[PDB]
């Protein structure tokens, strides 16, 4: 095996076509399916893999009760091929309530954070064995991307945060070669709160679109140089902001150099990537709740501040259905790098009081240079047919 480099250009994207759907919640009503949250897709050179933070229990289980807590000792990173539901034969590759997984072309690297909130330890498991570990440096909740990391020429970069979820936090970018942390760069630039990044390879570097839980409904951008370990940071230029909660389309704004201070007190994991001067971004249709999901391109939305000329809008999940975390992952094609994204379809407690569990499904969409149609691909599970 050779080190995966991502040297091909980005594929032409005219939109996104459906790629995968697990139907996990629908299958949970008639089988042993893991309770999961915060899923992501990461691909090795041959095939793509599902990842999720299991809750240590199945849905039709007494332990699925009150599975809405983010950090428990029983949370493990589940891993199987994309399209295979998280059944009892699923492999829990590590203990983690925060995770990030990437393939360098030779072996899988898993960054897994578990332990106490104030004294968390992040384990760096490469090729199935623990190679390195770090402790919490701010003595607050240490976390990571909750999505795939990016390895360029054997150097994997992961964005880790440790600090306040509603204030200043110490975000560090960790550079990892074969599981060993060779460098650590603090976040530098205009972004004032970076967490839960969706990182994609933009050769020769790594571009991450993160989530601002402090002050911005516009998404921070982190540009990682994997050679000299330098970090630049800004915000997405488009005036159509991708974080929720947010202002409506006519009142939202972004100026690429600071948080917009427009319902920036929270956020959701999302994604964005640049197609030249334009930006392809996905966001929930609901401005307040994580209900629905849409993707569109903003013309000059990456270079021109406060750009609101949107085009090629696709409804991934309609308004009336719950969405959740979304993230980007890249696939090496024959001649170019394709940008694909997943959407988490959260179901259960904290919005739906008909059941005691909180699990999710995933729907995956890959960028396409051809044509496509419309449609909605929600969870599809009747909450009245599920076990309580």
């Amino acid at each position, epitope marked *: 095996a050779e080190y995966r480099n991502w040297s091909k250009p980005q594929c032409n994207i005219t939109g996104f076509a459906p790629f995968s759907k697990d139907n996990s919640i629908r299958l949970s009503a008639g089988g042993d399916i893991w309770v999961t949250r915060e899923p992501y897709v990461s691909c090795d050179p041959d095939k793509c893999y599902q990842f999720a933070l299991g809750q240590g229990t199945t849905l039709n289980n007494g332990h699925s009760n009150d599975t809405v807590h983010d950090r428990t000792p029983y949370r493990t990173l589940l891993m199987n091929e994309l399209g295979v539901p998280f059944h009892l034969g699923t492999k829990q590759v590590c203990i983690a309530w925060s995770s990030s997984s990437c393939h360098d072309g030779k072996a899988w690297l898993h960054v897994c954070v578990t332990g106490d909130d104030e004294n968390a330890t992040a384990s760096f498991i490469y090729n199935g064995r623990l190679v390195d570990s770090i402790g919490s440096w701010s003595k607050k909740i240490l976390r990571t991307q909750e999505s795939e990391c990016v390895c360029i020429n054997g150097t994997c970069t992961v964005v880790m945060t440790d600090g306040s979820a509603s204030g200043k936090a110490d975000t560090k970018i960790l550079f990892i070669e074969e599981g060993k942390i060779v460098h650590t*760069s603090p976040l*530098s630039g*205009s972004a004032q709160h970076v967490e839960e990044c969706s990182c994609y390879p933009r050769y020769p570097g790594v571009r991450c679109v993160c989530r601002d839980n402090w002050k911005g409904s516009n998404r921070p951008i982190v540009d990682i*140089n994997v050679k000299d370990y*330098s970090i*630049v940071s800004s915000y997405v230029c488009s005036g159509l902001v991708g974080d929720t909660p947010r202002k409506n389309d006519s009142s939202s704004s972004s100026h690429c*150099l*600071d948080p917009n*201070n427009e319902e920036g007190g929270h956020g959701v994991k999302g994604w964005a990537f640049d197609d030249g001067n334009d930006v392809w971004m996905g966001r929930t249709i609901s401005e307040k709740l994580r209900s629905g999901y849409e993707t569109f391109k903003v013309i000059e939305g990456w270079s021109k501040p406060n750009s609101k000329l949107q085009i090629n809008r696709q409804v991934i999940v309609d308004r009336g259905n719950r969405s959740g975390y979304s993230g980007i992952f890249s696939v090496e094609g024959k001649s170019c790098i394709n940008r694909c994204f997943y959407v988490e379809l959260i179901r259960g407690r904290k919005q739906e009081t008909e059941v005691l569990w909180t699990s999710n499904s995933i729907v995956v969409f890959c960028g396409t240079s051809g044509t496509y149609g419309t449609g909605s691909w929600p969870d599809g599970a009747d909450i009245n047919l599920m076990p309580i």
Partner: antibody
Amino acid sequence: EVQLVESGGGLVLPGRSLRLSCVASGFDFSSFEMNWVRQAPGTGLEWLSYISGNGDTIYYAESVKGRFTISRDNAKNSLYLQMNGLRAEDTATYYCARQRSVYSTSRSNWSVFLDDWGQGTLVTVS
Amino acid sequence: EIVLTQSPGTLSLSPGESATLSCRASQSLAPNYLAWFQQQPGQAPRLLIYGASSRAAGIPDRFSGSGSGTDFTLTITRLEPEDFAVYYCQQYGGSPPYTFGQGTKVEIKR
């Protein structure tokens, strides 16, 4: 043209207070970030304070943190530096600098710098 | 904190020659956040190169910036009498202590 004129300064006694004013002209004041840079006589440039376009984000140098206080009035296009507890080490020419951002489409990541500097104001603490 | 260190604290060159000024960052600094300023003995600082590689408006092609990470360089080919000043490299935009370099004076050698 973009111009910044620093006011205030003069002669002050140690432990007193001063309020420099940087009046901006030729650009939308609220859209750019403002910085205070002082240069002691015979010494290099020293960056002191930073303020965002709306004043929410403010940074201070370790030397002047707690004593100095930066503020701005976007309606009056004015940048203020309220100094407190002045010492002899605060004798310097104080510059008001505006941050500028250039996209740099080759890199695509918004190079950020201080471009427009005023002629400065001399503050002597004695 | 990024601490910038200009290596040639004082430089002695001759008109028409090429001067090379270096700025060293304590940690890896992005090129986007390094700028070069030229200050005459009785004038305000003037921005020459921003982004460590791109000349400012009105700056002649004499000045050329380069470098990334921890090493940044300023090149002044075909020196002129107005190019003998104090040159500062500043880290701005990366981390809140936006400090300047200690400065580099370019002098006429005789």
